[PDB]
Amino acid sequence: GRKKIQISRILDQRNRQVTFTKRKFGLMKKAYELSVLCDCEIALIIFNSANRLFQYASTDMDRVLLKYTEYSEPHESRTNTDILETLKRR
Amino acid sequence: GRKKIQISRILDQRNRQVTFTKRKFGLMKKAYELSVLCDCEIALIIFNSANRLFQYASTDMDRVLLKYTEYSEPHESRTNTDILETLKRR
Amino acid sequence: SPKGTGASTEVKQKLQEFLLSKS
DNA sequence: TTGCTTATAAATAGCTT
DNA sequence: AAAGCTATTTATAAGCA
Secondary structure (H helix, E strand, O other): OOOOOOOOOOOOOOHHHHHHHHHHHHHHHHHHHHHHHOOOEEEEEEEOOOOOEEEEEOOOHHHHHHHHHOOOOOOEEEOHHHHHHHHHHO | OOOOOOOOOOOOOOHHHHHHHHHHHHHHHHHHHHHHHOOOEEEEEEEOOOOOEEEEEOOOHHHHHHHHHHOOOOOOOOOHHHHHHHHHHO | OOOOOOOOOOHHHHHHHHHHHOO
16 A cells, blocks of 8 residues: 555544455455465455445355354464464564 | 466465465455454355365454354355456456 | 364354254 | 565555546 | 555565575
């Protein structure tokens, strides 16, 4: 971007809506890429303030979530709290 | 990247594993960003060939997936094709 | 760099009954 | 692998209007 | 909230330490 921006709730509701749309797309774009590049399935679920649901699925959303439900073994599970720290490092 | 790469199953299993890890992180990073910037909840579910599960949640996968049980009407859903498609169209 | 257990154990249960009936 | 380093390819903040 | 357009900031293929 033409200027560096910290990561914190964009205040101007106008700009916080222009950005949600722009990025949401890029996010899904990368998802899709990661999906094809490394041949893996991905489900992406987004919820905005107004609780409007947005989603993506490399192929089918119902399939991925199902497989997910019946998945009891362990696995990598991150959060923003986590991600924030992992970033405070490199 | 130091060179442009098409998007198709990375063949060299070595490189297709280095990339999965690198990107998967960046993806989650952006998710996290979109999450904080536009104050919205996001769940990210990844599955690799070996069916190893990887996931992210802006706060807790619990909340979102549960919160996805109520408002199940996706104001926007996308498949790998929409994206692929929307990629040229524009 | 924290890993962790499955995402949930109960919620996953509720999510499923839904997904299936959604048919 | 196990990583760090660093050119390039990419994503995008802030303007037009 | 809508489209392009840089100027810059990021994300990252290859390198090679």
